[PDB]
């Protein structure tokens, strides 16, 4: 009795998921597909968390005239892997429910992925996914029907793409799957579009990693439209790599804003080893800017376990002791290397001096050159003058250095009173928020 | 290093570069995009060892991009090479996109009744007619008529009515279905008259099939001519129905004129 | 008849867009 009960609830959930998708697909267009398919996908994720009986339920899913209730009785009668994957099509063709057949093909793959064999059997699941992909290829290319499969089964193809990524993660990588995704991008170029292409492209960047940054640059050129970001999590995924691309490309200032936007869009728990990686990129890039971000604002516990290094490193950046920074680099070099942001830490070792100058610029309106030398422990006043030229850098108040008695005049912007001097400054800020009044137009359109 | 191959000025290297670009267009879309200005010079250069192949790789620069018009420009450079890829996954869509460019250009030419119609690209027209020939090979009347009125050319339409030569539904009331969805009467009348002529070409011209010319064309002489043939063959039984059908289906005017032609 | 169906669906959109303008125009008149 205890082992059958999980099977009964899962089978009932799958039957409800199939019935809802099929009924909507039959009536209307656009509302026909993906109206509850995303809900069905989260229900499928719950089914993945909740666990062979599922393959027997899959067997002979459809024959001709609808007999799904009779089929459910037949699944109970079986109670009372590779062959099972192809068994329903072999036993009897559905004779209808083409969007359902792709969903039916997807249902056995999830248990095969759940098994996580990391073996040829998992590759056989990939072969079953390829057969499902062929049905997806013909959904509009050969079938002249509406894109119910493109609207819904493309998400199923995206899950299959992630399973394909799992097989490649077990091995090395498949650029050919990305090329197949490029063919899907041509399908996206057609009447209907999907943003799954960017996520696989992010994996392509990841595979090249340090060895090639061209793929990231190619990604920047590849960037197109898809501002719908219906997944939203997908937009965060695009943002996380896009921010990574800028951070490696030395555009740290743009990257931190992108990472913050990416950090905000995390509806999924991302409890362990997940959101922490997104947090890690934001903190390092802000440290690279030289502004010091304390970890107290967020401090996720899993972020904390990986943050024992960075937290000491943040203390090291505040401290003037290079040896403390060296101890942190040697002791905590591991894990940061796993993150892949270790190269950013290597550039950060030089950046420690910049943090002090930024503190000086906020603290002192007109600091003495010799005083700057004492504050940053410059060996000589001329070295401090050289540092002052570096201090002007970009995005800081004009030094306007006299080069004589004035020394580091570092004059701050004046008349910054949100008055005439900032009249553009405090009106432009309103324009952006007032521009967000678009939400009233967008939601009004939905009814 | 496709750019590096272009940097050395060797004609054999020029062929090597286009072949290498053809091999991995997807892997380095940006590299072709960075060198697209160099590629465009080579594609339009007669001196280039394979300008047609350079045009084929130029379409590959636009493989990621969606510009059909650029592919039509590439078809001009490719010449036969664009036609040579009669069926090729992605290119088949791009040639179809060129067919869409061709139909809109042809519809614009049909719109002009004063002549001076802009010339269709011969290479673009060649891919369109070749795909149109594939539709005749398929034997589907619908596929054959698929570019028949898109080109707005009666000569292509005569080939489409011929199709695989079965001509069963097309040699009957296919005109009525086309007339219902037809947008322009001026192009429609040419289609209507030619289709009734093909019906006349059949050994028996159905009076119902030739009725559309009798009423929609409303040519009094043409109805008099078919009526004269009925008198000549003395087929009074067939003649009786068409005359009554004409009176019910259409107004007098031309009907009165054929009565005048018949009386004298 | 895919070529004919393409014309038929195109006609349906053209008619709907033509009608869509009328509703907005009358609605603006109602506001006055």
């Amino acid at each position: 009795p205890p082992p059958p009960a999980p099977q009964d609830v899962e089978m009932k959930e799958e039957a409800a998921t199939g019935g809802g998708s099929t009924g909507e697909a039959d009536g209307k267009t656009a509302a026909a597909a993906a109206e509850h398919s995303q809900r069905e996908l989260d229900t499928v994720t719950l089914e993945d968390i909740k666990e062979g009986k599922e393959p027997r339920f899959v067997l002979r899913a459809l024959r001709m005239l609808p007999s799904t209730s009779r089929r459910l009785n037949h699944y109970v009668l079986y109670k009372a892997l590779l062959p099972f994957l192809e068994e329903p099509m072999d036993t009897e063709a559905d004779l209808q429910f083409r969007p359902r057949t792709g969903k039916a093909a997807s249902t056995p793959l999830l248990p095969e992925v759940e098994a996580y064999l990391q073996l040829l059997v998992v590759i056989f699941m990939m072969n079953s996914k390829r057969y499902k992909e062929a049905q997806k290829i013909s959904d509009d290319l050969m079938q002249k029907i509406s894109t119910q499969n493109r609207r819904a089964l493309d998400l199923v193809a995206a899950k299959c793409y992630y399973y394909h990524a799992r097989v490649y993660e077990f091995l090395d990588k498949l650029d050919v799957v990305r090329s197949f995704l490029h063919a899907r991008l041509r399908t996206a170029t057609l009447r209907h579009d999907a943003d799954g292409q960017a996520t696989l492209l992010n994996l392509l960047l990841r595979n090249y990693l340090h060895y090639s940054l061209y793929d990231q640059a190619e990604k920047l050129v590849s960037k197109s439209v898809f501002p719908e970001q219906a997944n939203n999590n997908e937009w965060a995924r695009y943002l996380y790599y896009t921010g990574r691309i800028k951070a490696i490309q030395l555009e740290y200032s743009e990257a931190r804003r992108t990472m913050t936007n990416a950090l905000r869009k995390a509806p999924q728990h991302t409890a362990v080893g997940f959101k922490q990686t997104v947090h890690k990129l934001l903190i390092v890039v802000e440290l690279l800017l030289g502004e010091i971000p304390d970890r107290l604002q967020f401090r996720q516990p899993s972020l904390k376990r990986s943050l024992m290094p960075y937290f000491l490193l943040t203390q090291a950046v505040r401290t003037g002791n290079l040896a403390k920074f060296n101890q942190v680099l040697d002791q905590f070099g591991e894990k940061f290397q796993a993150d892949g942001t270790y190269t950013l830490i290597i550039r950060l070792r030089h950046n420690v001096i910049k943090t002090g100058v930024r503190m000086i610029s906020l603290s002192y309106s007109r600091i003495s050159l010799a005083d700057i030398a004492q504050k940053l422990q410059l060996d000589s006043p001329e070295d401090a003058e050289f540092i002052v030229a570096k201090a002007i850098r970009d995005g800081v108040i004009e030094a306007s250095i006299n080069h004589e008695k004035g020394y580091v005049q570092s004059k701050e912007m004046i008349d910054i009173y949100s008055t005439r001097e900032p009249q553009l400054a405090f009106h432009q800020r309103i324009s952006f928020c007032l521009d967000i009044h678009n939400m009233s137009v967008k939601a009004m359109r939905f009814p | 290093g496709i750019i590096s191959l272009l940097d050395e000025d060797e004609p054999q290297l020029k062929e090597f570069a286009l072949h290498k670009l053809n091999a991995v267009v997807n892997d380095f879309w940006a590299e072709i995009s960075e060198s697209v200005d160099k590629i465009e010079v080579l594609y339009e250069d007669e001196g280039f060892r394979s300008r047609q192949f350079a045009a084929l790789v130029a379409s590959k620069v636009f493989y990621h991009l969606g510009a059909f018009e650029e592919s039509l420009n590439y078809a001009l450079g490719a010449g036969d090479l664009f036609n040579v890829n009669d069926n090729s996954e992605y290119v088949e869509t791009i040639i179809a996109k060129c067919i869409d460019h061709y139909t809109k250009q042809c519809v614009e030419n049909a719109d002009l009744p004063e002549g001076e119609k802009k010339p269709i690209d011969q290479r673009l027209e060649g891919i369109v007619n070749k795909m149109f020939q594939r539709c005749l090979d398929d034997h589907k009347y619908k596929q054959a008529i698929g570019i028949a009125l898109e080109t707005r050319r009666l000569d292509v339409f005569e080939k489409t009515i011929l199709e695989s030569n079965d001509v069963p539904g097309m040699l009957a009331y296919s005109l009525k279905l086309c007339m219902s969805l037809m947008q322009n009467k001026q192009f429609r009348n040419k289609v209507l008259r030619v289709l009734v002529k093909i019906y006349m070409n059949l050994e028996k011209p159905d009076f119902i099939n030739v009725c559309q010319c009798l009423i929609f064309l409303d040519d009094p002489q043409a109805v008099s001519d078919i009526l004269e043939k009925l008198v000549k063959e003395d087929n009074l039984l067939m003649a009786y129905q068409i005359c009554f059908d004409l009176y019910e289906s259409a107004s007098q005017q031309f009907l009165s004129s054929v009565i005048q032609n018949l009386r004298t | 008849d895919l070529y004919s169906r393409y014309k038929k669906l195109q006609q349906e959109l053209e008619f709907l867009e033509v009608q869509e303008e009328y509703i907005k125009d009358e609605q603006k008149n109602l506001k006055k």
């Binding site: 057609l190 359109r445 939905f446 009814p447 | - | 393409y6």
Partner: peptide
């Protein structure tokens, strides 16, 4: 595919009828 996938593009334009229903409700 040119005359069998372009009709599919007109299916994309069918969503405008849903907007027409929303505006029709406003007219009422």
């Amino acid at each position: 595919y040119l005359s069998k996938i372009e009709e599919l593009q007109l299916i994309v334009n069918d969503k405008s009828q849903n907007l027409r229903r929303l505006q029709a409700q406003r007219n009422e």
